[PDB]
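Q: Given only this backbone (77 positions), what sequence would you predict?
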């Protein structure tokens, strides 16, 4: 799954946030439903639909200790 970069509600294909993803990107639906904790940095959101996200890994970010924290859908185990 494609790794998208997140910043202030918007999504980008690069980690520097210079190339915006198309406004109809499927992940915007996922973002309407999923809250991204504000303390995380280096947030990666997978390009998939909200339906697909329900049972899968949705996003990953780095906490203040530089450790990666994974976040899964409501119907994931």
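A: Predicted residues:
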């Amino acid at each position: 799954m494609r790794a998208l970069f997140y910043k202030d509600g918007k999504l980008f294909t690069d980690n520097n946030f210079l190339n915006p993803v198309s406004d109809d990107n499927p992940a915007y639906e996922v973002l309407q439903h999923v809250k991204i904790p504000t303390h995380l940095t280096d947030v990666v959101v997978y390009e998939q639909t909200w339906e697909e996200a329900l049972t899968r890994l949705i996003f990953v970010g780095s906490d203040s200790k530089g450790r990666r924290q994974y976040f899964y859908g409501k119907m994931h185990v």
